[PDB]
Design an enzyme around this catalytic site. Sequence first.
Site, PDB file in Angstrom:
ATOM      1  N   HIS B  41       0.806  -1.216   0.000  1.00 47.92           N
ATOM      2  CA  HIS B  41       0.000   0.000   0.000  1.00 47.92           C
ATOM      3  C   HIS B  41       0.844   1.273   0.000  1.00 47.92           C
ATOM      4  O   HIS B  41       0.293   2.363   0.186  1.00 47.92           O
ATOM      5  CB  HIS B  41      -0.975   0.003   1.187  1.00 47.92           C
ATOM      6  CG  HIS B  41      -0.325   0.207   2.521  1.00 47.92           C
ATOM      7  ND1 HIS B  41      -0.269  -0.785   3.478  1.00 47.92           N
ATOM      8  CD2 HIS B  41       0.266   1.294   3.072  1.00 47.92           C
ATOM      9  CE1 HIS B  41       0.346  -0.323   4.553  1.00 47.92           C
ATOM     10  NE2 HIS B  41       0.681   0.935   4.332  1.00 47.92           N
ATOM     11  N   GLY B 142       3.747   6.068   9.910  1.00 47.23           N
ATOM     12  CA  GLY B 142       5.071   5.840   9.373  1.00 47.23           C
ATOM     13  C   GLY B 142       5.798   4.616   9.889  1.00 47.23           C
ATOM     14  O   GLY B 142       7.002   4.489   9.642  1.00 47.23           O
ATOM     15  N   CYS B 144       4.580   1.314   9.401  1.00 48.56           N
ATOM     16  CA  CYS B 144       4.305   0.155   8.564  1.00 48.56           C
ATOM     17  C   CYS B 144       5.584  -0.324   7.884  1.00 48.56           C
ATOM     18  O   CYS B 144       6.455   0.466   7.515  1.00 48.56           O
ATOM     19  CB  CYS B 144       3.234   0.510   7.536  1.00 48.56           C
ATOM     20  SG  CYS B 144       1.631   0.788   8.309  1.00 48.56           S
TER      21      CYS B 144
HETATM   22  C1  LIG Z   1       1.317   2.513   8.099  1.00 54.28           C
HETATM   23  N1  LIG Z   1       2.470   3.070   8.302  1.00 54.28           N
HETATM   24  C2  LIG Z   1       0.058   2.782   8.913  1.00 54.28           C
HETATM   25  C3  LIG Z   1       0.227   2.392  10.386  1.00 54.28           C
HETATM   26  C4  LIG Z   1      -0.913   2.879  11.291  1.00 54.28           C
HETATM   27  C5  LIG Z   1      -0.949   4.350  11.680  1.00 54.28           C
HETATM   28  C6  LIG Z   1      -1.749   4.358  12.970  1.00 54.28           C
HETATM   29  N2  LIG Z   1      -1.450   3.046  13.534  1.00 54.28           N
HETATM   30  C7  LIG Z   1      -0.990   2.181  12.636  1.00 54.28           C
HETATM   31  O1  LIG Z   1      -0.697   0.992  12.856  1.00 54.28           O
HETATM   32  N3  LIG Z   1      -1.069   2.087   8.313  1.00 54.28           N
HETATM   33  C8  LIG Z   1      -1.936   2.719   7.517  1.00 54.28           C
HETATM   34  O2  LIG Z   1      -1.836   3.914   7.248  1.00 54.28           O
HETATM   35  C9  LIG Z   1      -3.078   1.878   6.941  1.00 54.28           C
HETATM   36  C10 LIG Z   1      -3.022   1.829   5.413  1.00 54.28           C
HETATM   37  C11 LIG Z   1      -4.176   1.075   4.747  1.00 54.28           C
HETATM   38  C12 LIG Z   1      -3.993   0.986   3.235  1.00 54.28           C
HETATM   39  C13 LIG Z   1      -4.332  -0.316   5.344  1.00 54.28           C
HETATM   40  N4  LIG Z   1      -4.374   2.335   7.418  1.00 54.28           N
HETATM   41  C14 LIG Z   1      -4.674   2.267   8.721  1.00 54.28           C
HETATM   42  O3  LIG Z   1      -3.968   1.668   9.531  1.00 54.28           O
HETATM   43  C15 LIG Z   1      -5.970   2.943   9.174  1.00 54.28           C
HETATM   44  N5  LIG Z   1      -6.891   1.984   9.816  1.00 54.28           N
HETATM   45  S1  LIG Z   1      -8.192   1.431   9.024  1.00 54.28           S
HETATM   46  C16 LIG Z   1      -8.083  -0.319   8.929  1.00 54.28           C
HETATM   47  O4  LIG Z   1      -8.111   1.941   7.686  1.00 54.28           O
HETATM   48  O5  LIG Z   1      -9.342   1.750   9.821  1.00 54.28           O
HETATM   49  C17 LIG Z   1      -5.786   4.244  10.025  1.00 54.28           C
HETATM   50  C18 LIG Z   1      -4.818   5.204   9.324  1.00 54.28           C
HETATM   51  C19 LIG Z   1      -7.140   4.945  10.177  1.00 54.28           C
HETATM   52  C20 LIG Z   1      -5.245   3.949  11.428  1.00 54.28           C
END
Ligand SMILES: *C(=N)[C@H](C[C@@H]1CCNC1=O)NC(=O)[C@H](CC(C)C)NC(=O)[C@@H](NS(C)(=O)=O)C(C)(C)C
Lengths: 271, 299
Positions: B41, B142, B144
Amino acid sequence: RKMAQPSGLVEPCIVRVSYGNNVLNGLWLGDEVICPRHVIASDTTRVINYENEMSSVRLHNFSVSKNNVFLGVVSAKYKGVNLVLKVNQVNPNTPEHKFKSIKAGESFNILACYEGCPGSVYGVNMRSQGTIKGSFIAGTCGSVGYVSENATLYFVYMHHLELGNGSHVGSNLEGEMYGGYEDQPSMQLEGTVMSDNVAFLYAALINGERWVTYNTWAKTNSFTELTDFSMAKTGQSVEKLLDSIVNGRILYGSLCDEFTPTEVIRQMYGV
Amino acid sequence: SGLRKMAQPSGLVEPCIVRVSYGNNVLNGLWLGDEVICPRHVIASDTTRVINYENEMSSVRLHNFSVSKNNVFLGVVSAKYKGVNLVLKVNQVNPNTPEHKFKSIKAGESFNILACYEGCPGSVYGVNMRSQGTIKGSFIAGTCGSVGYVSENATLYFVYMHHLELGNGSHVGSNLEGEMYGGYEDQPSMQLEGTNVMSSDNVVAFLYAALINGERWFVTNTSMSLESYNTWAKTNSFTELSSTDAFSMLAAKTGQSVEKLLDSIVRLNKGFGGRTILSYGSLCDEFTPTEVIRQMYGV
Ligand SMILES: *C(=N)[C@H](C[C@@H]1CCNC1=O)NC(=O)[C@H](CC(C)C)NC(=O)[C@@H](NS(C)(=O)=O)C(C)(C)C
Ligand SMILES: *C(=N)[C@H](C[C@@H]1CCNC1=O)NC(=O)[C@H](CC(C)C)NC(=O)[C@@H](NS(C)(=O)=O)C(C)(C)C
């Protein structure tokens, strides 16, 4: 989550140091190994005369090693409660480092090592009487405490003993025992206080736990003295949390004083 | 003596963390050999709405990638999906690639997380895999691509790479082959986790850590058989104990059989009554049997 900074720079400096019945850890920097001086005690269960043991010290009885390298000891001196051994080989993996002491309430990392073998890493907090609450057992003395601040590696702790109340005592790398304790098997006493840290409730409500509804109260009942915590994101004043401090449902069944405010923020808001 | 959640040392994993960025997204990747594994992603143009990964793969340009370790770059020469993971071939072999294997972590098992922000390892901590394929980390923006690893008998295993946080706060990641843990999607969805089931093996071990640390008020003159506990566990969100064999050493040293701790679980599940066990106010299943044995007796 209580966290620890990465251990990659410290791992290659841990050596197995044994003398007689005693096996523990040493810090190999350059051509010197720093270890707890009680490794040369003929009987660590009874009172030690460190001048007698140093008078009868035989350098050929040491065993200093890292992996398959045997480090012959050419010289041995006391520096405070620490033993400093000059060895016949420089550590080719000596990282850039400085020495530093830790004050109460601060946080640092412990690389727990078992008879020369690094096994675990975890973050700690320097307590009231200069102690920490970690988890040390037999063979973990010489375990190294370190802190990394702006590309600087600081060696700040070497483990020596556990008190009768289960708290853990160590020295800095220059030989001064934190809390002023002595490296004798006689009984010593920690003080009766809790921390700025009990920041723990500020993180307890960002996670969804809100079951919230003072230096005068804190001076006479074993709490440190204390609002500039500002980042206002949870909408609760600190005296609206100082009321909760004034002690069957918190991320924990007691108040947690192990996380500095800077850590908990640099972990929730990062950067 | 003490009990603390431990992490295995991170020296072998640190030199393999790199910064990976595409467009406005920045995360971390695992640099092994001439390959970098990161979450797919990162090439998505907008991570806040549903992503068509088929289109994002159709419009990816290799020159838009930015892979680097310690601010020195690595040239991307091939990008490819493998499951939910992007596999990037780079123009330089990692000269610090440790001997390693890939494997998936089962429910109740413990492993270590090397939290990384923008390619730089920030902190390390131990975690435990929950029954629904999630964990309780402290991931922020940041992080992931942060790497989960465990070491067994001097064999280094890469087991986890972080992707997303659910709505309930749980954290979801993949194994290193692109198979997301728990079967969740790598989408900005509102997918729910399910009912967390406590690991009975871990709860017994945590009570042995209490006994070793002198806390024994929860043990009484009562003990419950294995099947009787297993029957109670089926309806109280606790896994079933296949045997009491992984506790032979802990039962000998403490003098308390597992069946006595099994009865304490059914009682302590009701509540602690304000009493805390090694700083914990409820039952904790984060520590595994061998995790307790190694912290209490070395081994
Ligand atoms: C990646 N670096 C990030 C890590 C998150 C930030 C907050 N806590 C974490 O673990 N992950 C994301 O930005 C992902 C990306 C998508 C494509 C999966 N999105 C989320 O984790 C998202 N949750 S969700 C499943 O979409 O409700 C957040 C950004 C709303 C936390
Ligand atoms: C060092 N390798 C070892 C670590 C201990 C073992 C239990 N937890 C620990 O922190 N400690 C010692 O060898 C020392 C030796 C003395 C001479 C300093 N022993 C103790 O700390 C001792 N407590 S004391 C000095 O009597 O207050 C024990 C062994 C009784 C805990």
